[PDB]
């Protein structure tokens, strides 16, 4: 499991 | 043991990217962008729905998913048509199904519009998860070096 470093919340 | 050097990864994810045979378990609306328990609870819920439909004679949709600089794309297997498209900037979290080595899911959407997409892979889910990890890390690195466009 991991977070996407390029994710954009807005 | 696959080569994950930058040059190799670029060739791997460019264009159509990497394709994997799979089945769509389902898509569920969730309250946050990330969370191990959030994802496992959603996966458990969606699988429960599938199991209930399976007792009625219903089967999961056969698909193939691709991982590329364009993000995650889900195509219908029978027709080859694109059915779902989630851009890299729209995907927030990737999670393996703790109870199934052949299942995983991801959370996508902007704030207030989060959804968990659950996938049952034909083979092990690990390679797909690692490809997503490598893809995201690569994009981050290329962006930091201002070279994403020259490699996409």
């Amino acid at each position: 499991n991991f977070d996407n470093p390029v994710y954009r919340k807005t | 043991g696959q080569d994950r050097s930058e040059a190799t990864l670029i060739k791997r994810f460019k264009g159509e990217g990497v394709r994997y045979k799979a089945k769509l378990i389902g898509i569920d609306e969730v309250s946050a962008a990330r969370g191990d328990k959030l994802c496992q609870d959603s996966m458990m819920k969606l699988k429960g729905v599938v199991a209930g439909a399976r007792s009625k004679g219903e089967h999961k949709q056969k698909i193939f998913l691709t991982i590329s600089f364009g993000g995650i794309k889900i195509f219908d297997e029978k027709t080859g048509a694109l059915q779902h498209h989630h851009a890299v900037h729209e995907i927030s979290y990737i999670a393996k199904d703790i109870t199934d080595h052949r299942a995983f899911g991801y959370v996508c959407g902007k704030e207030g519009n989060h959804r968990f997409v659950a996938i049952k892979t034909a083979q092990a889910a690990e390679p797909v998860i690692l490809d997503l990890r490598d893809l995201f890390q690569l994009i981050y690195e290329l962006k930091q070096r201002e070279e994403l466009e020259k490699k996409a």
Side-chain angles (χ1 to χ4, degrees):
Chain A
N1 293 34
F2 56 85
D3 297 281
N4 174 7
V6 198
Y7 174 63
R8 299 276 61 182
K9 300 180 180 180
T10 61
Chain B
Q2 217 165 63
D3 171 31
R4 304 181 189 287
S5 69
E6 196 184 79
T8 297
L9 295 184
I10 295 174
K11 306 181 80 171
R12 191 178 178 76
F13 302 125
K14 57 184 254 187
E16 293 180 55
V18 189
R19 73 180 307 186
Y20 290 98
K21 183 179 183 175
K23 292 180 180 182
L24 179 61
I25 294 173
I27 304 178
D28 186 25
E29 303 181 10
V30 296
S31 64
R34 62 193 73 71
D36 301 302
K37 196 174 189 62
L38 181 71
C39 293
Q40 200 50 53
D41 272 300
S42 188
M43 178 60 85
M44 183 171 86
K45 175 183 174 182
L46 292 172
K47 280 189 169 185
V49 175
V50 173
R54 183 269 191 173
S55 63
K56 293 187 177 183
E58 280 72 300
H59 292 292
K60 292 185 290 291
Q61 181 187 184
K62 293 178 179 180
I63 62 167
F64 64 86
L65 59 163
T66 67
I67 300 179
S68 67
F69 284 109
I72 300 177
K73 292 178 181 178
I74 296 172
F75 300 79
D76 173 71
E77 186 176 80
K78 293 176 184 181
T79 65
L82 179 59
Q83 193 173 103
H84 305 283
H85 176 15
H86 304 304
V88 172
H89 65 266
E90 304 185 308
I91 302 167
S92 58
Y93 196 72
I94 306 301
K96 189 177 186 183
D97 185 340
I98 59 168
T99 71
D100 193 345
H101 63 291
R102 292 174 52 216
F104 83 95
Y106 60 92
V107 185
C108 63
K110 302 300 178 182
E111 189 173 61
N113 185 214
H114 305 294
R115 294 186 296 163
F116 180 72
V117 179
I119 307 294
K120 178 75 174 299
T121 54
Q123 290 301 304
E126 182 163 58
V128 187
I129 295 173
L130 293 184
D131 265 334
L132 285 163
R133 177 201 64 183
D134 294 341
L135 170 69
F136 296 162
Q137 181 58 52
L138 176 65
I139 294 176
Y140 168 75
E141 295 179 359
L142 297 179
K143 265 290 185 179
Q144 193 72 184
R145 299 166 57 187
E146 304 182 301
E147 296 185 303
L148 180 62
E149 298 181 1
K150 293 89 172 186
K151 302 296 176 58

